[PDB]
Design a protein around this ligand. Structure first.
Ligand code: FME
Ligand code: MG
Ligand code: MG
Ligand code: MG
Ligand code: MG
Ligand code: MG
Ligand code: MG
Ligand code: MG
Ligand code: MG
Ligand code: MG
Ligand code: MG
Ligand code: MG
Ligand code: MG
Ligand code: MG
Lengths: 50, 75, 177, 66, 136, 116, 75
RNA sequence: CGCGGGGUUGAGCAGCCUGGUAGCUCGUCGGGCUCAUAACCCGAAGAUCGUCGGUUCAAAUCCGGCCCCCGCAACCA
RNA sequence: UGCCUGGCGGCCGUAGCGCGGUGGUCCCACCUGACCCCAUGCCGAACUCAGAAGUGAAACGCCGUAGCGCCGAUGGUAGUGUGGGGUCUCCCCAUGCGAGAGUAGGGAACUGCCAGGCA
RNA sequence: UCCUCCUAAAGAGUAACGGAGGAGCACGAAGGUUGGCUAAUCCUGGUCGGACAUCAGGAGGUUAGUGCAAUGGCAUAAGCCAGCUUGACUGCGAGCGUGACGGCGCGAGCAGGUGCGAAAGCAGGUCAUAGUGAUCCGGUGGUUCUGAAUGGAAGGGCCAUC
RNA sequence: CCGACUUACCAACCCGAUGCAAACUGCGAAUACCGGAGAAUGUUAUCACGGGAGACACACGGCGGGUGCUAACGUCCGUC
């Protein structure tokens, strides 16, 4: 509805992304969560893009 | 204005007392937590008590508030 | 403090002889003094609550706690969480000092002095009192003041009887009737 | 206390117009002189002298010059 | 008439009517009209029988009505096919079992309460009887 | 009340230790003494008991009931348990904050040879 | 949205004014022939023997579909 | 009570189109003009936005209930 | 061995409330102070630290009392499985199971592992 | 189409144009962990302040609360605050529950890398059950898996996703 | 102003007694159901896999019930 989809692209250099939904009215800035990257097998930072 | 209902959820005790259950088998499918998890049983996010080690189910009443507890004998 | 040592020196003996006690720790004693102001309206002027807290902090040198609405009562257009008043609880040295410097100079400054009522009791030996204005304390100097905000003072003691609560504050030279 | 969030509290010597030296602590920092405190307050005569206005009988009689 | 001023739900199941009753003793007054039959009893027959009770004594004595309808009874209108919903609430009945003491009065002579009950027993659809207070 | 509001503060971790089946080192702290005891997994019978109220640790200490006193009783249970064959326990908090003389009890016991 | 109008300042003024005014007139026409259609749909579509005469217009209101109008940011 | 509509100052109507602003025409009241009424010019008045509720920082506007009025429908053999 | 106190349980109102009394050598609580280890949406009130001057008032423990809470028969009543019957929108007979409420009454716990003080 | 209660006859299931209410979401905290906390409602005393705002004492005991309807729950709190954080992880998964099938649900434990905590430990989203649609066709990213003589490439496949 | 007085009138919370409920429960059966042990009996009556089907318009009667008017050889469920 109002909460639409974004993807958290990996900042470990590879092509990997988790998918989540974010309320774009209240939060206008990106998401920054440390999430597991299985290609490199370590916890890197995961910025959002689309 | 009426005539709506939901599919039955098939709750209730699955393995009654005295039944020799294997490991990981569901014992009670619950909605709240009417039966509390005792010894060698768990409690999922759905509140479904499941055997955590094979044996014989045991229903018992204990605790300050006369709660219903489910245990397992290591047999 | 001064009033604390006055108490422990002579009021203990006075009350012991007046109530035929047998242990020192049985005499009623003051336990805390809580002074609060319910500013009523802060929804209109959110800063007036800040100014009221500043007034209370000037009156008693402790930063007040801002007490917020408990239930969303519909009469006065408030909801849960709205800041409604400010409160200070004083214990020990600060309690005794404020008690002394109230009863000595702040009380006589009320216009048309009468003497505080003797029936202002909750029934368990704890006293309550209003002031109707705060200028009577020496801590307001007619500069930032815009309202005539007052205080509400509750002296809570370990007295277990209304009569004992009467006598405890009477023995301290309270301006009674 | 909680590390300098309260107004400054120090000992001051506030005296009355009738002498009345007291050693107190207050958050003013400047000495204060004021009216009579309860140490010498007219709390027993300030009320007995308050009733002075009233009664035109004696005013009529003092006007009885004729 | 009689009616629950408020009800949690608009319509109620037909249900059944079995077993004996619980209000079997005269507890407020001194003479009572104990039911002997069975069957639901409307709220128009409560008032049409109380009016005969209050008219025979003509002022004398309190009377107690120890029964209350609190049971809605629906009724499909005329010339309407079956189904397509439940009916419309029309009246309220008090399910009466044998033994249920219906009315009781007090302060009047026995021979006059017998005649007032007999006048009010003829407006009811169930067999009734006369019962006096006991010591238990 | 302070003891009802503290036993309530302890019932959470007490029961988790029971369902994990763990022998627990339970502490009780008093403004005058400090007690410690190792308790069997069933929670009913004790194994090792040592406290500053004991006349074997009372005179060695200048004062019973400070961080120094707690440190001494810490070594008392740890050595006592090791002679009894118990190496793994769980520190039961009893609602007291792990901050003061309670902490000095665990630190002395942990370092002295006990493992938790 | 940025939409490029060739020309000059006056050219943009006249172009924007003319286009917005024609849009707010297309809207009027669509509103009129939707309201008239909906009048017929409300009159019919419940008649017992003429019910199926509102369904050739119920589907035609579904084909006019006035275009989205967004509030001008001038104010 | 099955489907739509509206209740706003004394009368008839905008304002509800995406919450902050109660308005227009006639009418009522007080002056002026006139020999006097009308017309005309000046000034002001009055309304709980049908009534009770809910999100709302605010409501009339958004939502819900209740009443009043105004239109359609309650089929064929 | 006996009594009292502290900790951890078993058991969970026959075990909990209310009223009267009682205990400070040990233990427990209150208590003195607080720059500091720590803390308060403010307040050493709570959490926490250093120690013992006083009390047993408050709390707590213990004892006694039925005013409540609580437990609760026997007999009867209701219901009901199977087989029969009736004037069959409700019941009865044979037989097996047999409540709920209420009545007489019971009743202000019992017990285990350690560690102290005095026996 | 999905969820909750009753009819439903004390395991599960069970129909009608039977009786009553909801859903087509919300949340980078309203998730994780650690530490702490305990309500409604009336009685007395006080400046405005009154039946009801804030304060103090007592009675009460969860009659409060839960982002959202109902039921089942919850004090060890699943209810209320505060610090740090991203387990709202990747690959698997003994064993079960419920489905005619498509499928849906619960899950101890193992391997890799984190978070909170002194530690034992808890964490694979939220107190639980609603918040959702198969296949075809096509889009974007990664990947020598294939590449119609051979080297490439288009195009297929595979993984994530619209 | 104060409420100065008066009420034949209404009246919540509580206390004692008497009732009612499918969507009430501080209580609570008979049956039914799940699991275990044991005899007697029953041409395996049980399970699994495989070849072939038919059937998915049911009706009445007893018991428990919705709807109906506790009307219908009425209508919709559970069990025999
Ligand atoms: C309509 O139903 C009537 C029936 C009679 S025909 C035998 N007439 C039709 O035309
Ligand atoms: Mg069932
Ligand atoms: Mg059944
Ligand atoms: Mg939550
Ligand atoms: Mg916690
Ligand atoms: Mg939580
Ligand atoms: Mg939820
Ligand atoms: Mg090639
Ligand atoms: Mg390719
Ligand atoms: Mg078919
Ligand atoms: Mg069929
Ligand atoms: Mg059939
Ligand atoms: Mg038939
Ligand atoms: Mg048929």
């Amino acid at each position: 509805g109002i909460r639409e989809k974004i993807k958290l692209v990996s900042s470990a250099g590879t092509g990997h992304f988790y998918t989540t939904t974010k309320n774009k009215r209240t939060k206008p800035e990106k998401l920054e969560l440390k999430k597991f990257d299985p290609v490199v097998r370590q916890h890197v930072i995961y910025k959002e893009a689309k | 204005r009426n005539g709506r209902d939901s599919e039955a959820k098939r709750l209730g005790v699955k393995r009654f007392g005295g039944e020799s259950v294997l490991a990981g088998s569901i014992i009670v499918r619950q909605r709240g937590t009417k039966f509390h998890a005792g010894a060698n049983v768990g409690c999922g996010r759905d509140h479904t008590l499941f055997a955590k080690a094979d044996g014989k189910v045991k229903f018992e009443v204990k605790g300050p508030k006369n709660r219903k507890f489910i245990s397992i004998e290591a047999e | 403090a001064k009033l604390h040592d006055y108490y422990k020196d002579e009021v203990v003996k006075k009350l012991m002889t007046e109530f035929n006690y047998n242990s020192v720790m049985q005499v009623p004693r003051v336990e805390k003094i809580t002074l609060n102001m319910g500013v009523g309206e802060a929804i209109a002027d959110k800063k007036l609550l800040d100014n009221a807290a500043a007034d209370l902090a000037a009156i008693s040198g402790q930063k007040p706690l801002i007490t917020k609405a408990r239930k969303s009562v519909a009469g006065f257009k408030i909801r849960q969480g709205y800041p409604i008043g400010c409160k200070v609880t004083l214990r020990g040295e600060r309690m005794w000092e404020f008690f002394e410097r109230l009863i000595t100079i702040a009380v006589p400054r009320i216009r048309d002095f009468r003497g505080l009522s003797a029936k202002s009791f909750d029934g368990r030996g704890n006293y309550s009192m209003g002031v109707r204005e705060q200028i009577i304390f020496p801590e307001i100097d007619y500069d930032k003041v815009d309202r005539v905000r007052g205080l509400d003072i509750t002296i809570t003691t370990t007295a277990k009887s209304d009569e004992e609560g009467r006598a405890l504050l009477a023995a301290f030279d309270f301006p009674f009737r | 206390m909680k590390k300098d969030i309260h107004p400054k509290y120090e000992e001051i010597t506030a005296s009355c117009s009738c002498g009345n030296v007291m050693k107190i602590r207050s958050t003013v920092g400047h000495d204060l002189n004021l009216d009579v405190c309860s140490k010498c307050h007219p709390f027993f005569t300030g009320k007995q002298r308050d009733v002075a206005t009233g009664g035109r009988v004696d005013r009529f009689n003092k006007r009885f010059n004729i | 008439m009689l009616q629950p001023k408020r009800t949690k739900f608009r319509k109620m199941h037909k249900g059944r009517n079995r077993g004996l009753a619980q209000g079997t003793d005269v507890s407020f007054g001194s003479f009572g009209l104990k039911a002997v039959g069975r069957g639901r009893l409307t709220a128009r027959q409560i008032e049409a029988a109380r009016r005969a009770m209050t008219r025979a004594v003509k002022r004398q004595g309190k009377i107690w009505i120890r029964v209350f309808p609190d049971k809605p009874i629906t009724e499909k209108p005329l010339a309407v096919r079956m189904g397509k919903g439940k009916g419309n609430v029309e009246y309220w009945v008090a399910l009466i079992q044998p033994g249920k003491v219906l009315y009781e009065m007090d302060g009047v002579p026995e021979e006059l309460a017998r005649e007032a009950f007999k006048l009010a027993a003829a407006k009811l659809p169930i067999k009734t009887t006369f019962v006096t207070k006991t010591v238990m | 009340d302070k003891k009802s509001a503290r036993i309530r503060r302890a019932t959470r971790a007490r029961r988790k230790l029971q369902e994990l089946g763990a022998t627990r080192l339970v502490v009780h702290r008093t403004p005058r003494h400090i007690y410690a005891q190792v308790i069997a997994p069933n929670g009913s019978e004790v194994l090792v008991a040592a406290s500053t109220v004991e006349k074997a640790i009372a005179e060695q200490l200048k004062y019973t009931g400070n961080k120094d006193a707690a440190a001494a009783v810490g070594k008392a249970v740890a050595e006592r348990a090791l002679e009894k064959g118990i190496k793994d326990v769980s520190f039961d908090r009893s609602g007291f904050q792990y901050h003061g003389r309670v902490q000095a009890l665990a630190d002395a016991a942990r370092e002295a040879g006990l493992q938790f | 949205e940025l939409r490029v109008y060739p020309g000059n300042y006056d050219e943009y003024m006249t172009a924007a004014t003319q286009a917005r005014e024609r849009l707010l007139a297309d809207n009027a026409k669509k509103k009129a022939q939707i309201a008239e259609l909906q009048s017929f749909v409300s009159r019919f579509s419940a008649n017992a023997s003429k019910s199926r005469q509102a369904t050739s217009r119920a589907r035609q209101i579904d084909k006019i579909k006035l275009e989205e109008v967004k509030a001008s940011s001038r104010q």
